[PDB]
């Protein structure tokens, strides 16, 4: 009956969703998509995510309803389970605000830092500096907020789940967290959670 | 007015002024002067710690602050029951395309703008990267727009979030030529009176 099909890969955006699924205890199975073999481009997967990127899910119990965009998936699952996002207007919106900050800010900016710092054919220091500097500024925003509240929206939520897989890999991105004591507390808190440990292993 | 809007004449600000105009919500405009560093006044950071526009404060609701354009759109849609369906599939379709815009179109077209128009040096590889990625995202929109009249079916906050970016494609150096469905959608949306009004906020 209840079954989420998860199409994913070992990346921060993929880990957002596997962590959420493990936190919520929903049954799911993995299709690990191989970049090398063009799998994310096949018409069969594009029928699920026309953007041809992971993660995406198909909710088998909802007439095989497809959801793409990690942030939209986190919302869909939170609403499905009633977990990790409060039901009240203000509580709901705090979560969505910080989820959007991750979706429009942290992910894209840290993603571009990775691109130029690690992947781009040519070393473009100005582009590297732009994105590491911007990523750091965003980390300082998070750090400030985490001085006011234990987790981004108050209690641990999909907002933290969206953001943590990115912060986790800051060194790879070439961005430091030193001096950000609230962010560090939060990093240590979330990395300790058994569901986070489990989700980080998916796909194997 | 029950809503205070902090904004500027950018695509992200326009998303929100279009939405307010569509929904018939009264609002007071606070046009932040970046020339005078108003986005860095401590008083504004208490509303949006990211120090960007737009942001709102809902005076009707204990002066609740909402930042992130995508989160403001969801907040306003839920408040009024307009421009996003109540049912599970319909609401998720809207959030999926909205997240597509917030994590994809806005960020990628925004970086095209940076390297094409504003960056201290001309890095042709960076310009190409983001203009190409932006066109690809437009192609995805165009495919979806063959399946439905608007991105989530009926016109919604997902279209409102996407249109102000697509509108300025030439500023970004990105063509919409050859994308008939996207072009149909452009023409439909630009003809909406609330869109015409929202694009004029704030006054010069």
């Amino acid at each position: 009956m209840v079954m989420i099909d998860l199409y994913t890969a070992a990346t921060p955006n993929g880990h957002k969703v596997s962590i959420a699924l493990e936190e919520m205890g929903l049954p799911y199975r993995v299709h690990a998509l191989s970049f090398d073999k063009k799998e994310q481009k096949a018409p069969e997967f594009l029928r699920i995510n026309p953007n041809g990127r992971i993660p995406a899910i198909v909710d088998r119990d909802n007439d095989d309803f497809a959801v793409f965009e990690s942030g939209a998936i986190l919302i869909y699952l939170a609403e499905k389970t009633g977990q990790l996002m409060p039901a009240d207007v203000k509580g709901r919106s705090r979560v969505i605000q910080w989820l959007m900050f991750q979706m429009g800010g942290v992910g894209p900016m840290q993603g571009q830092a990775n691109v130029f710092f690690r992947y781009f054919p040519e070393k473009l220091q100005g582009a590297i500096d732009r994105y590491q500097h911007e990523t750091r500024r965003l980390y300082e925003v998070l750090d400030g907020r985490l001085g006011e509240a234990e987790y981004l929206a108050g209690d641990y939520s999909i907002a933290d789940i969206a953001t943590y897989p990115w912060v986790r890999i800051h060194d790879w991105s070439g961005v430091a967290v030193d001096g950000l004591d609230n962010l560090q507390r939060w990093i240590a808190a979330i990395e300790a959670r058994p569901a986070v440990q489990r989700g980080l292993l998916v796909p194997r």
Side-chain angles (χ1 to χ4, degrees), chain A residues 1-203:
Chain A
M1 188 200 189
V2 184
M3 182 61 63
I4 301 300
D5 285 7
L6 162 66
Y7 297 80
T8 193
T11 75
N13 296 329
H15 295 144
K16 294 175 185 173
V17 177
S18 57
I19 288 164
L21 288 163
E22 289 291 337
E23 293 280 12
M24 306 176 163
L26 285 173
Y28 67 100
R29 62 176 188 170
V30 174
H31 310 232
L33 295 200
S34 173
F35 287 164
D36 301 328
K37 327 201 69 176
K38 354 267 287 170
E39 302 176 18
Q40 48 190 142
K41 297 265 161 288
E44 230 134 357
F45 182 73
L46 295 180
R47 301 198 184 115
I48 294 166
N49 182 5
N51 193 36
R53 286 186 74 191
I54 67 80
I57 61 163
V58 173
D59 183 356
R60 301 222 80 176
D61 193 37
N62 197 9
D63 310 302
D64 282 346
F65 184 69
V67 189
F68 68 98
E69 293 299 316
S70 57
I73 292 155
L74 292 171
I75 291 168
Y76 180 89
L77 292 173
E79 295 187 341
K80 184 164 186 83
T81 57
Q83 298 179 47
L84 296 161
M85 180 167 51
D88 67 286
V89 171
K90 294 180 190 157
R92 183 205 306 155
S93 176
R94 308 209 169 88
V95 168
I96 292 169
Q97 284 176 63
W98 288 101
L99 179 60
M100 290 298 189
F101 178 82
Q102 187 285 313
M103 287 291 296
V106 177
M109 296 298 96
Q110 190 168 349
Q112 302 328 286
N114 287 355
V115 163
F116 295 104
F117 191 45
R118 297 286 184 181
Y119 305 140
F120 207 64
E122 190 187 0
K123 164 161 187 163
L124 311 175
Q125 192 62 47
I128 291 163
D129 289 345
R130 179 183 153 78
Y131 297 110
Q132 297 184 330
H133 275 91
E134 173 61 6
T135 298
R136 172 71 183 199
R137 186 192 69 78
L138 291 170
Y139 283 9
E140 285 165 3
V141 173
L142 293 174
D143 183 70
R145 164 63 175 164
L146 289 166
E148 307 182 328
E150 199 187 359
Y151 295 97
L152 293 171
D155 285 341
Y156 181 68
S157 76
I158 54 170
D160 305 286
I161 292 164
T163 303
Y164 168 83
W166 280 100
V167 176
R168 193 188 151 254
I169 63 168
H170 66 87
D171 283 333
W172 177 251
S173 292
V175 182
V177 303
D178 33 59
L180 307 179
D181 300 327
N182 309 308
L183 189 64
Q184 288 177 21
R185 177 199 74 232
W186 173 97
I187 288 174
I190 289 165
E191 89 193 340
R193 307 187 53 94
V196 166
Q197 295 169 7
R198 295 192 299 275
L200 282 176
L201 295 173
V202 178

